[PDB]
Amino acid sequence: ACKDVFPAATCRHAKSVGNCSSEKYKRNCAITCGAC
Protein backbone atom coordinates (compact mmCIF):
# COMPACT_ATOMS: atom_id res chain seq x y z
CA ALA A 1 0.00 0.00 0.00
CA CYS A 2 1.01 3.63 -0.53
CA LYS A 3 -1.21 5.31 2.07
CA ASP A 4 -0.04 8.75 3.20
CA VAL A 5 2.35 8.01 6.07
CA PHE A 6 3.11 11.55 7.23
CA PRO A 7 0.41 13.52 9.10
CA ALA A 8 -2.25 15.41 7.15
CA ALA A 9 -0.81 18.56 8.73
CA THR A 10 2.58 17.87 7.15
CA CYS A 11 1.07 16.76 3.84
CA ARG A 12 -1.50 19.55 3.59
CA HIS A 13 1.33 22.10 3.60
CA ALA A 14 2.88 20.63 0.45
CA LYS A 15 -0.03 21.20 -1.93
CA SER A 16 -0.62 24.53 -0.17
CA VAL A 17 2.62 25.76 -1.74
CA GLY A 18 2.86 23.12 -4.45
CA ASN A 19 5.66 21.23 -2.72
CA CYS A 20 4.67 18.02 -4.50
CA SER A 21 7.99 18.35 -6.34
CA SER A 22 9.74 17.42 -3.09
CA GLU A 23 9.97 13.86 -1.76
CA LYS A 24 9.04 14.25 1.90
CA TYR A 25 5.43 14.25 0.69
CA LYS A 26 5.85 12.22 -2.50
CA ARG A 27 7.42 8.92 -1.42
CA ASN A 28 5.36 8.49 1.75
CA CYS A 29 2.51 10.90 0.99
CA ALA A 30 1.93 9.65 -2.55
CA ILE A 31 -1.79 9.94 -1.82
CA THR A 32 -1.34 13.67 -1.26
CA CYS A 33 1.12 14.18 -4.12
CA GLY A 34 -0.33 12.03 -6.88
CA ALA A 35 2.45 9.64 -7.86
CA CYS A 36 1.05 6.31 -6.66
Side-chain angles (χ1 to χ4, degrees):
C2 55
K3 292 290 195 292
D4 39 271
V5 191
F6 273 67
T10 295
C11 290
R12 67 177 284 161
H13 181 61
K15 303 304 301 306
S16 209
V17 299
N19 227 296
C20 192
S21 311
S22 217
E23 212 84 357
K24 191 171 212 152
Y25 359 80
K26 198 267 271 284
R27 51 144 58 167
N28 47 73
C29 222
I31 303 306
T32 296
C33 214
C36 175

PDB file of all heavy atoms in Angstrom:
ATOM      1  N   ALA A   1       0.824  -1.202   0.000  1.00  0.00           N
ATOM      2  CA  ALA A   1       0.000   0.000   0.000  1.00  0.00           C
ATOM      3  C   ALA A   1       0.862   1.257   0.000  1.00  0.00           C
ATOM      4  O   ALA A   1       2.021   1.228   0.418  1.00  0.00           O
ATOM      5  CB  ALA A   1      -0.934  -0.001   1.201  1.00  0.00           C
ATOM      6  N   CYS A   2       0.292   2.361  -0.472  1.00  0.00           N
ATOM      7  CA  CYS A   2       1.009   3.629  -0.528  1.00  0.00           C
ATOM      8  C   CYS A   2       0.231   4.727   0.194  1.00  0.00           C
ATOM      9  O   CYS A   2       0.228   5.882  -0.230  1.00  0.00           O
ATOM     10  CB  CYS A   2       1.256   4.036  -1.982  1.00  0.00           C
ATOM     11  SG  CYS A   2      -0.255   4.117  -2.998  1.00  0.00           S
ATOM     12  N   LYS A   3      -0.428   4.355   1.286  1.00  0.00           N
ATOM     13  CA  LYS A   3      -1.209   5.306   2.069  1.00  0.00           C
ATOM     14  C   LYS A   3      -0.312   6.386   2.665  1.00  0.00           C
ATOM     15  O   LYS A   3       0.794   6.103   3.126  1.00  0.00           O
ATOM     16  CB  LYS A   3      -1.962   4.580   3.186  1.00  0.00           C
ATOM     17  CG  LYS A   3      -3.070   3.671   2.681  1.00  0.00           C
ATOM     18  CD  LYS A   3      -4.228   4.469   2.107  1.00  0.00           C
ATOM     19  CE  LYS A   3      -5.471   3.608   1.943  1.00  0.00           C
ATOM     20  NZ  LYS A   3      -5.298   2.582   0.878  1.00  0.00           N
ATOM     21  N   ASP A   4      -0.796   7.623   2.655  1.00  0.00           N
ATOM     22  CA  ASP A   4      -0.038   8.745   3.197  1.00  0.00           C
ATOM     23  C   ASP A   4       0.444   8.442   4.612  1.00  0.00           C
ATOM     24  O   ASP A   4      -0.355   8.338   5.543  1.00  0.00           O
ATOM     25  CB  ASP A   4      -0.895  10.013   3.197  1.00  0.00           C
ATOM     26  CG  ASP A   4      -2.335   9.739   3.586  1.00  0.00           C
ATOM     27  OD1 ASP A   4      -3.147   9.446   2.684  1.00  0.00           O
ATOM     28  OD2 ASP A   4      -2.649   9.818   4.792  1.00  0.00           O
ATOM     29  N   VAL A   5       1.757   8.301   4.766  1.00  0.00           N
ATOM     30  CA  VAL A   5       2.347   8.010   6.067  1.00  0.00           C
ATOM     31  C   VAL A   5       2.360   9.249   6.954  1.00  0.00           C
ATOM     32  O   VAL A   5       1.786   9.252   8.043  1.00  0.00           O
ATOM     33  CB  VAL A   5       3.785   7.478   5.924  1.00  0.00           C
ATOM     34  CG1 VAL A   5       4.281   6.919   7.250  1.00  0.00           C
ATOM     35  CG2 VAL A   5       3.857   6.424   4.831  1.00  0.00           C
ATOM     36  N   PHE A   6       3.018  10.302   6.481  1.00  0.00           N
ATOM     37  CA  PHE A   6       3.106  11.549   7.232  1.00  0.00           C
ATOM     38  C   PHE A   6       1.718  12.055   7.610  1.00  0.00           C
ATOM     39  O   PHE A   6       0.707  11.669   7.024  1.00  0.00           O
ATOM     40  CB  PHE A   6       3.843  12.611   6.413  1.00  0.00           C
ATOM     41  CG  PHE A   6       5.336  12.562   6.572  1.00  0.00           C
ATOM     42  CD1 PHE A   6       6.061  11.479   6.104  1.00  0.00           C
ATOM     43  CD2 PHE A   6       6.013  13.600   7.191  1.00  0.00           C
ATOM     44  CE1 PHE A   6       7.435  11.432   6.249  1.00  0.00           C
ATOM     45  CE2 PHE A   6       7.387  13.559   7.339  1.00  0.00           C
ATOM     46  CZ  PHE A   6       8.099  12.473   6.868  1.00  0.00           C
ATOM     47  N   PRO A   7       1.666  12.943   8.616  1.00  0.00           N
ATOM     48  CA  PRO A   7       0.408  13.521   9.096  1.00  0.00           C
ATOM     49  C   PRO A   7      -0.211  14.482   8.086  1.00  0.00           C
ATOM     50  O   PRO A   7       0.499  15.160   7.345  1.00  0.00           O
ATOM     51  CB  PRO A   7       0.824  14.273  10.363  1.00  0.00           C
ATOM     52  CG  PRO A   7       2.265  14.589  10.159  1.00  0.00           C
ATOM     53  CD  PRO A   7       2.831  13.448   9.360  1.00  0.00           C
ATOM     54  N   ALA A   8      -1.539  14.535   8.064  1.00  0.00           N
ATOM     55  CA  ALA A   8      -2.253  15.415   7.147  1.00  0.00           C
ATOM     56  C   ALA A   8      -1.771  16.856   7.281  1.00  0.00           C
ATOM     57  O   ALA A   8      -1.821  17.628   6.325  1.00  0.00           O
ATOM     58  CB  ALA A   8      -3.751  15.333   7.396  1.00  0.00           C
ATOM     59  N   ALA A   9      -1.305  17.210   8.475  1.00  0.00           N
ATOM     60  CA  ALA A   9      -0.813  18.558   8.732  1.00  0.00           C
ATOM     61  C   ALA A   9       0.498  18.813   7.998  1.00  0.00           C
ATOM     62  O   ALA A   9       0.783  19.939   7.588  1.00  0.00           O
ATOM     63  CB  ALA A   9      -0.634  18.776  10.228  1.00  0.00           C
ATOM     64  N   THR A  10       1.295  17.762   7.833  1.00  0.00           N
ATOM     65  CA  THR A  10       2.576  17.873   7.148  1.00  0.00           C
ATOM     66  C   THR A  10       2.413  17.690   5.643  1.00  0.00           C
ATOM     67  O   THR A  10       3.238  18.159   4.859  1.00  0.00           O
ATOM     68  CB  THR A  10       3.585  16.835   7.674  1.00  0.00           C
ATOM     69  OG1 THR A  10       3.902  17.108   9.044  1.00  0.00           O
ATOM     70  CG2 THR A  10       4.859  16.849   6.841  1.00  0.00           C
ATOM     71  N   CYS A  11       1.346  17.007   5.247  1.00  0.00           N
ATOM     72  CA  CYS A  11       1.074  16.764   3.836  1.00  0.00           C
ATOM     73  C   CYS A  11       0.246  17.896   3.237  1.00  0.00           C
ATOM     74  O   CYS A  11       0.413  18.251   2.069  1.00  0.00           O
ATOM     75  CB  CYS A  11       0.340  15.433   3.658  1.00  0.00           C
ATOM     76  SG  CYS A  11       1.370  13.966   3.986  1.00  0.00           S
ATOM     77  N   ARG A  12      -0.646  18.461   4.044  1.00  0.00           N
ATOM     78  CA  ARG A  12      -1.500  19.553   3.594  1.00  0.00           C
ATOM     79  C   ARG A  12      -0.666  20.764   3.186  1.00  0.00           C
ATOM     80  O   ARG A  12      -1.017  21.487   2.253  1.00  0.00           O
ATOM     81  CB  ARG A  12      -2.484  19.947   4.698  1.00  0.00           C
ATOM     82  CG  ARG A  12      -1.817  20.562   5.917  1.00  0.00           C
ATOM     83  CD  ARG A  12      -2.842  21.002   6.951  1.00  0.00           C
ATOM     84  NE  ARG A  12      -3.508  22.243   6.567  1.00  0.00           N
ATOM     85  CZ  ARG A  12      -4.665  22.646   7.080  1.00  0.00           C
ATOM     86  NH1 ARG A  12      -5.282  21.909   7.994  1.00  0.00           N
ATOM     87  NH2 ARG A  12      -5.208  23.788   6.680  1.00  0.00           N
ATOM     88  N   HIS A  13       0.440  20.978   3.891  1.00  0.00           N
ATOM     89  CA  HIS A  13       1.325  22.100   3.602  1.00  0.00           C
ATOM     90  C   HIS A  13       1.857  22.020   2.175  1.00  0.00           C
ATOM     91  O   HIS A  13       1.830  23.004   1.436  1.00  0.00           O
ATOM     92  CB  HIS A  13       2.491  22.127   4.592  1.00  0.00           C
ATOM     93  CG  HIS A  13       3.442  23.262   4.368  1.00  0.00           C
ATOM     94  ND1 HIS A  13       3.063  24.586   4.439  1.00  0.00           N
ATOM     95  CD2 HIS A  13       4.763  23.265   4.075  1.00  0.00           C
ATOM     96  CE1 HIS A  13       4.110  25.355   4.197  1.00  0.00           C
ATOM     97  NE2 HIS A  13       5.154  24.577   3.973  1.00  0.00           N
ATOM     98  N   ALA A  14       2.340  20.842   1.793  1.00  0.00           N
ATOM     99  CA  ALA A  14       2.876  20.634   0.455  1.00  0.00           C
ATOM    100  C   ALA A  14       2.003  21.307  -0.598  1.00  0.00           C
ATOM    101  O   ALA A  14       2.331  22.384  -1.096  1.00  0.00           O
ATOM    102  CB  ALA A  14       3.004  19.146   0.163  1.00  0.00           C
ATOM    103  N   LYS A  15       0.887  20.666  -0.933  1.00  0.00           N
ATOM    104  CA  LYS A  15      -0.035  21.203  -1.927  1.00  0.00           C
ATOM    105  C   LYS A  15      -0.227  22.705  -1.735  1.00  0.00           C
ATOM    106  O   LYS A  15      -0.197  23.471  -2.698  1.00  0.00           O
ATOM    107  CB  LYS A  15      -1.386  20.491  -1.835  1.00  0.00           C
ATOM    108  CG  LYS A  15      -1.292  18.985  -2.006  1.00  0.00           C
ATOM    109  CD  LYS A  15      -0.613  18.612  -3.313  1.00  0.00           C
ATOM    110  CE  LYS A  15      -1.367  19.168  -4.511  1.00  0.00           C
ATOM    111  NZ  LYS A  15      -2.800  18.763  -4.501  1.00  0.00           N
ATOM    112  N   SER A  16      -0.421  23.118  -0.488  1.00  0.00           N
ATOM    113  CA  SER A  16      -0.619  24.528  -0.171  1.00  0.00           C
ATOM    114  C   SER A  16       0.337  25.404  -0.974  1.00  0.00           C
ATOM    115  O   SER A  16      -0.066  26.415  -1.551  1.00  0.00           O
ATOM    116  CB  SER A  16      -0.416  24.770   1.325  1.00  0.00           C
ATOM    117  OG  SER A  16      -1.192  25.867   1.775  1.00  0.00           O
ATOM    118  N   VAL A  17       1.606  25.010  -1.008  1.00  0.00           N
ATOM    119  CA  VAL A  17       2.621  25.757  -1.740  1.00  0.00           C
ATOM    120  C   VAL A  17       3.198  24.927  -2.882  1.00  0.00           C
ATOM    121  O   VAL A  17       4.328  25.148  -3.313  1.00  0.00           O
ATOM    122  CB  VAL A  17       3.767  26.204  -0.813  1.00  0.00           C
ATOM    123  CG1 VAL A  17       3.243  27.123   0.279  1.00  0.00           C
ATOM    124  CG2 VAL A  17       4.468  24.994  -0.213  1.00  0.00           C
ATOM    125  N   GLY A  18       2.412  23.971  -3.366  1.00  0.00           N
ATOM    126  CA  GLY A  18       2.862  23.122  -4.454  1.00  0.00           C
ATOM    127  C   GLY A  18       4.237  22.536  -4.201  1.00  0.00           C
ATOM    128  O   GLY A  18       5.150  22.709  -5.007  1.00  0.00           O
ATOM    129  N   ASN A  19       4.386  21.842  -3.077  1.00  0.00           N
ATOM    130  CA  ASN A  19       5.661  21.231  -2.719  1.00  0.00           C
ATOM    131  C   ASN A  19       5.716  19.777  -3.180  1.00  0.00           C
ATOM    132  O   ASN A  19       6.624  19.032  -2.813  1.00  0.00           O
ATOM    133  CB  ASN A  19       5.880  21.306  -1.207  1.00  0.00           C
ATOM    134  CG  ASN A  19       7.266  21.804  -0.848  1.00  0.00           C
ATOM    135  OD1 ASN A  19       8.268  21.154  -1.146  1.00  0.00           O
ATOM    136  ND2 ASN A  19       7.330  22.964  -0.203  1.00  0.00           N
ATOM    137  N   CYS A  20       4.739  19.382  -3.989  1.00  0.00           N
ATOM    138  CA  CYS A  20       4.674  18.018  -4.502  1.00  0.00           C
ATOM    139  C   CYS A  20       5.998  17.617  -5.146  1.00  0.00           C
ATOM    140  O   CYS A  20       6.365  16.442  -5.154  1.00  0.00           O
ATOM    141  CB  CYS A  20       3.538  17.886  -5.518  1.00  0.00           C
ATOM    142  SG  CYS A  20       3.135  16.167  -5.963  1.00  0.00           S
ATOM    143  N   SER A  21       6.709  18.601  -5.686  1.00  0.00           N
ATOM    144  CA  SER A  21       7.991  18.351  -6.336  1.00  0.00           C
ATOM    145  C   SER A  21       8.956  17.654  -5.382  1.00  0.00           C
ATOM    146  O   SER A  21       9.760  16.818  -5.797  1.00  0.00           O
ATOM    147  CB  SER A  21       8.601  19.663  -6.829  1.00  0.00           C
ATOM    148  OG  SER A  21       7.653  20.425  -7.557  1.00  0.00           O
ATOM    149  N   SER A  22       8.871  18.004  -4.103  1.00  0.00           N
ATOM    150  CA  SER A  22       9.740  17.417  -3.090  1.00  0.00           C
ATOM    151  C   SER A  22       9.523  15.909  -2.996  1.00  0.00           C
ATOM    152  O   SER A  22       8.848  15.316  -3.837  1.00  0.00           O
ATOM    153  CB  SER A  22       9.482  18.066  -1.729  1.00  0.00           C
ATOM    154  OG  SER A  22      10.689  18.218  -1.001  1.00  0.00           O
ATOM    155  N   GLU A  23      10.098  15.297  -1.966  1.00  0.00           N
ATOM    156  CA  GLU A  23       9.969  13.860  -1.763  1.00  0.00           C
ATOM    157  C   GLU A  23       9.332  13.557  -0.410  1.00  0.00           C
ATOM    158  O   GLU A  23       8.627  12.559  -0.252  1.00  0.00           O
ATOM    159  CB  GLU A  23      11.338  13.182  -1.857  1.00  0.00           C
ATOM    160  CG  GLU A  23      11.282  11.770  -2.413  1.00  0.00           C
ATOM    161  CD  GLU A  23      11.278  11.739  -3.928  1.00  0.00           C
ATOM    162  OE1 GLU A  23      11.264  12.826  -4.543  1.00  0.00           O
ATOM    163  OE2 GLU A  23      11.290  10.629  -4.500  1.00  0.00           O
ATOM    164  N   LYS A  24       9.584  14.425   0.564  1.00  0.00           N
ATOM    165  CA  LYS A  24       9.036  14.253   1.903  1.00  0.00           C
ATOM    166  C   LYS A  24       7.548  13.920   1.844  1.00  0.00           C
ATOM    167  O   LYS A  24       7.036  13.169   2.674  1.00  0.00           O
ATOM    168  CB  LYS A  24       9.253  15.520   2.732  1.00  0.00           C
ATOM    169  CG  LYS A  24       8.955  15.339   4.211  1.00  0.00           C
ATOM    170  CD  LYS A  24       9.388  16.551   5.020  1.00  0.00           C
ATOM    171  CE  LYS A  24       9.840  16.155   6.417  1.00  0.00           C
ATOM    172  NZ  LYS A  24      10.835  17.116   6.971  1.00  0.00           N
ATOM    173  N   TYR A  25       6.859  14.483   0.857  1.00  0.00           N
ATOM    174  CA  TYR A  25       5.431  14.247   0.691  1.00  0.00           C
ATOM    175  C   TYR A  25       5.130  13.684  -0.695  1.00  0.00           C
ATOM    176  O   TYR A  25       4.112  14.013  -1.305  1.00  0.00           O
ATOM    177  CB  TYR A  25       4.649  15.545   0.907  1.00  0.00           C
ATOM    178  CG  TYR A  25       5.525  16.728   1.250  1.00  0.00           C
ATOM    179  CD1 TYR A  25       6.208  17.423   0.261  1.00  0.00           C
ATOM    180  CD2 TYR A  25       5.668  17.152   2.566  1.00  0.00           C
ATOM    181  CE1 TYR A  25       7.009  18.505   0.571  1.00  0.00           C
ATOM    182  CE2 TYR A  25       6.467  18.234   2.886  1.00  0.00           C
ATOM    183  CZ  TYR A  25       7.135  18.907   1.884  1.00  0.00           C
ATOM    184  OH  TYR A  25       7.932  19.984   2.197  1.00  0.00           O
ATOM    185  N   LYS A  26       6.022  12.832  -1.186  1.00  0.00           N
ATOM    186  CA  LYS A  26       5.854  12.218  -2.499  1.00  0.00           C
ATOM    187  C   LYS A  26       6.128  10.719  -2.438  1.00  0.00           C
ATOM    188  O   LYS A  26       5.503   9.936  -3.155  1.00  0.00           O
ATOM    189  CB  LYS A  26       6.789  12.878  -3.515  1.00  0.00           C
ATOM    190  CG  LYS A  26       6.396  12.619  -4.959  1.00  0.00           C
ATOM    191  CD  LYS A  26       7.112  11.404  -5.524  1.00  0.00           C
ATOM    192  CE  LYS A  26       8.452  11.781  -6.136  1.00  0.00           C
ATOM    193  NZ  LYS A  26       8.289  12.448  -7.458  1.00  0.00           N
ATOM    194  N   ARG A  27       7.061  10.326  -1.578  1.00  0.00           N
ATOM    195  CA  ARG A  27       7.416   8.921  -1.425  1.00  0.00           C
ATOM    196  C   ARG A  27       6.544   8.253  -0.365  1.00  0.00           C
ATOM    197  O   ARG A  27       6.200   7.078  -0.480  1.00  0.00           O
ATOM    198  CB  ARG A  27       8.893   8.784  -1.047  1.00  0.00           C
ATOM    199  CG  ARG A  27       9.303   9.656   0.128  1.00  0.00           C
ATOM    200  CD  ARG A  27      10.338   8.963   1.001  1.00  0.00           C
ATOM    201  NE  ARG A  27      11.534   8.597   0.247  1.00  0.00           N
ATOM    202  CZ  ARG A  27      12.674   8.219   0.816  1.00  0.00           C
ATOM    203  NH1 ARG A  27      12.771   8.154   2.136  1.00  0.00           N
ATOM    204  NH2 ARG A  27      13.718   7.901   0.061  1.00  0.00           N
ATOM    205  N   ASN A  28       6.191   9.012   0.668  1.00  0.00           N
ATOM    206  CA  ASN A  28       5.361   8.493   1.749  1.00  0.00           C
ATOM    207  C   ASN A  28       3.940   9.039   1.653  1.00  0.00           C
ATOM    208  O   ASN A  28       2.979   8.369   2.034  1.00  0.00           O
ATOM    209  CB  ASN A  28       5.968   8.856   3.105  1.00  0.00           C
ATOM    210  CG  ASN A  28       6.370  10.317   3.187  1.00  0.00           C
ATOM    211  OD1 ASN A  28       5.519  11.202   3.281  1.00  0.00           O
ATOM    212  ND2 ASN A  28       7.672  10.575   3.150  1.00  0.00           N
ATOM    213  N   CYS A  29       3.814  10.259   1.141  1.00  0.00           N
ATOM    214  CA  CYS A  29       2.511  10.896   0.995  1.00  0.00           C
ATOM    215  C   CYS A  29       2.067  10.896  -0.466  1.00  0.00           C
ATOM    216  O   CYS A  29       1.518  11.881  -0.958  1.00  0.00           O
ATOM    217  CB  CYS A  29       2.558  12.330   1.524  1.00  0.00           C
ATOM    218  SG  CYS A  29       1.103  12.807   2.512  1.00  0.00           S
ATOM    219  N   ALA A  30       2.308   9.783  -1.152  1.00  0.00           N
ATOM    220  CA  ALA A  30       1.932   9.654  -2.554  1.00  0.00           C
ATOM    221  C   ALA A  30       0.456   9.979  -2.758  1.00  0.00           C
ATOM    222  O   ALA A  30       0.064  10.495  -3.806  1.00  0.00           O
ATOM    223  CB  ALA A  30       2.239   8.250  -3.056  1.00  0.00           C
ATOM    224  N   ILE A  31      -0.357   9.675  -1.753  1.00  0.00           N
ATOM    225  CA  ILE A  31      -1.789   9.936  -1.823  1.00  0.00           C
ATOM    226  C   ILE A  31      -2.073  11.432  -1.882  1.00  0.00           C
ATOM    227  O   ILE A  31      -3.069  11.865  -2.463  1.00  0.00           O
ATOM    228  CB  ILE A  31      -2.532   9.330  -0.617  1.00  0.00           C
ATOM    229  CG1 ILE A  31      -2.275   7.825  -0.535  1.00  0.00           C
ATOM    230  CG2 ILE A  31      -4.023   9.616  -0.716  1.00  0.00           C
ATOM    231  CD1 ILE A  31      -2.610   7.085  -1.811  1.00  0.00           C
ATOM    232  N   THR A  32      -1.189  12.222  -1.280  1.00  0.00           N
ATOM    233  CA  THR A  32      -1.343  13.670  -1.264  1.00  0.00           C
ATOM    234  C   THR A  32      -0.674  14.308  -2.476  1.00  0.00           C
ATOM    235  O   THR A  32      -1.111  15.351  -2.963  1.00  0.00           O
ATOM    236  CB  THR A  32      -0.751  14.285   0.018  1.00  0.00           C
ATOM    237  OG1 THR A  32      -1.476  13.824   1.164  1.00  0.00           O
ATOM    238  CG2 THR A  32      -0.795  15.804  -0.039  1.00  0.00           C
ATOM    239  N   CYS A  33       0.388  13.674  -2.960  1.00  0.00           N
ATOM    240  CA  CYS A  33       1.119  14.179  -4.117  1.00  0.00           C
ATOM    241  C   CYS A  33       0.412  13.800  -5.415  1.00  0.00           C
ATOM    242  O   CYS A  33      -0.039  14.666  -6.164  1.00  0.00           O
ATOM    243  CB  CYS A  33       2.548  13.631  -4.122  1.00  0.00           C
ATOM    244  SG  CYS A  33       3.786  14.789  -4.789  1.00  0.00           S
ATOM    245  N   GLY A  34       0.319  12.499  -5.673  1.00  0.00           N
ATOM    246  CA  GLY A  34      -0.334  12.028  -6.880  1.00  0.00           C
ATOM    247  C   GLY A  34       0.590  11.205  -7.756  1.00  0.00           C
ATOM    248  O   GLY A  34       0.481  11.232  -8.982  1.00  0.00           O
ATOM    249  N   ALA A  35       1.502  10.473  -7.127  1.00  0.00           N
ATOM    250  CA  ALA A  35       2.448   9.639  -7.856  1.00  0.00           C
ATOM    251  C   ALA A  35       1.982   8.187  -7.900  1.00  0.00           C
ATOM    252  O   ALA A  35       2.032   7.539  -8.946  1.00  0.00           O
ATOM    253  CB  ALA A  35       3.830   9.732  -7.226  1.00  0.00           C
ATOM    254  N   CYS A  36       1.528   7.682  -6.757  1.00  0.00           N
ATOM    255  CA  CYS A  36       1.054   6.308  -6.663  1.00  0.00           C
ATOM    256  C   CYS A  36      -0.359   6.181  -7.225  1.00  0.00           C
ATOM    257  O   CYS A  36      -1.341   6.437  -6.528  1.00  0.00           O
ATOM    258  CB  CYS A  36       1.080   5.835  -5.208  1.00  0.00           C
ATOM    259  SG  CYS A  36       0.382   4.172  -4.955  1.00  0.00           S
TER     260      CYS A  36
END
